[model samples]
Target: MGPGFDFAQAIMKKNTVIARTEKGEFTMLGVYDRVAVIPTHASVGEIIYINDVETRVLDACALRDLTDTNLEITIVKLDRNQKFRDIRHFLPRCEDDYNDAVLSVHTSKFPNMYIPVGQVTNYGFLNLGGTPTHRILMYNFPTRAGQCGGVVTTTGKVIGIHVGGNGAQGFAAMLLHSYFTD
Candidate 1:
């Protein structure tokens, strides 16, 4: 949802700057994954933060089910507390949903901006569409480095956890309203 850059010197052995340029374009951010469905219940405090706000799983689903395009949904989560935080100012803020294990602060957010690598789809007989894949949908598109596992929001509703993306770019998201459907 945000963009930023880094300015630093890659000093060589000779004490010379390799890349003297400043304000270099860099991308740094966080992501989420699907929440755990243990005991078949929703976890507390596992919510998604959007536009500097918080939303529970149930609310996020209502947003998706009520809206036309889920694409307006910018982020997702696999667990609770997924967010973007930055050590330096201007760097992307890391939300509580960010997973420290699989996260890499440099390459993932260095050269290019964080982007969504896959499409969103809804499968199941209860789904509105006749075919499962037909329900496929994409969204505001999450970034590549953002980790998953928390709550996700659509428009303004907390729908599910942000999960898996492209390959190494994989992330997780929580399904807040899956229970209501069942």
Candidate 2:
């Protein structure tokens, strides 16, 4: 609709960025560039902060459904920017169950981070043993606590990563790449 509201206003005003820890009340939401897709028990053991303006290093993490939402990622490096690497996404196929279109920035009403939106209803029926790594994508909205890793999209583009769920059942994540390197 109106190009997903003008591409969510230039991706929430210039390509997302919000990763927190080490003092403020742990937070999430940072993909493609901030790459904060996390949850590895938030073992932020080495200090991290992307929303605070700078300083980042952890560069690696990935865990799925450890008895219900537990993931990880770290590449929180940003100085002055906007990036999507090789943008263009949305590809889910396996047993199939997709309502599609989902959104994030839903920092569960904290310090004001709007945009909840939803879909993806369920895709790939819980990638437990079946591989190709496409986490459990089953989102219909209502998520909280750093909103897991909210970045699941459809019809508009990109589809991957949303680590937790609650209030309306959640899980919609699968990102082949829009960029992330070592």
Candidate 3:
């Protein structure tokens, strides 16, 4: 299977952002259920630029605690005034299969204007006895230096967050159930 136009259509319209600070900038893969998923290492203390809008970070996952496969999986609680519209229905659990194809969705420099698509080469199935964390392998994943945060999907289901990589191979953090339940 290839990238689903319907999947892109449903999510492409949702609000996406380019999170920036003095440190770096990454994509804000749409807020789901009030939590914005960003690429990791952005400090909670810094003021983040989302699109043209300034936003604050409440919390994030620690890089020390994450595997390379999922290092960019940082979740931040947004300010009450900036809560994202509900898109929980599109979120696929981490347990979902890799299937035949996956798609990566992110923005171009024009600011909230386009959905540039890419492909996933392999679906991460093994934690390798938990030596590393869960992740999906990607191919020809086009990205810029600060453009780290993006979403990966198969058909209508969101499988992971595009954390980092370029050219032939990349990795995405699987959207585990525990991320929401825990």
Report the C-alpha lDDT of model 1 over 1-182, residue by residue, as the tens digit: 31111111111011111111122211112222332221011122335332223544432221233334331123223233543221112222212222111111222224321222233334211221221111122233433433332222222222233333443323332333323231
Candidate closer to the true structure by TM-score (higher is better), 1 or 3: 3
Q: Each model's TM-score, in the order given?
A: 0.23, 0.30, 0.69
Q: Model 2 compared with the native: what TM-score?
A: 0.30
lDDT score for candidate 2 against the true structure: 0.49
Report the number of clashing residue pairs per model: 65, 6, 0
Cα deviation of 50, candidate 1, in Å: 20
* Candidate ordering by lDDT (highest first): 3, 2, 1
Candidate maximizing lDDT: 3
Instruction: State the local distance difference test value for candidate 3.
Output: 0.56
Per-residue lDDT tens digits for candidate 3, residues 79-99, read: 637556666666665454454
Each prediction's Cα lDDT score?
0.25, 0.49, 0.56
User: How far in Å is the alpha carbon of 18 misplaced in model 1?
Assistant: 37
- Residue 139 lDDT in candidate 2: 63
User: Which RMSD does model 2 reach against the true structure?
Assistant: 14.4
Task: Encode model 2's per-residue lDDT on 1-182: one tens digit a residue.
Answer: 44554544444454445555653334354555434455444455455655665554645555544454432333343443554443433333333444435454633245434344655654554432233333556766666666554455545555555655656766655554433443
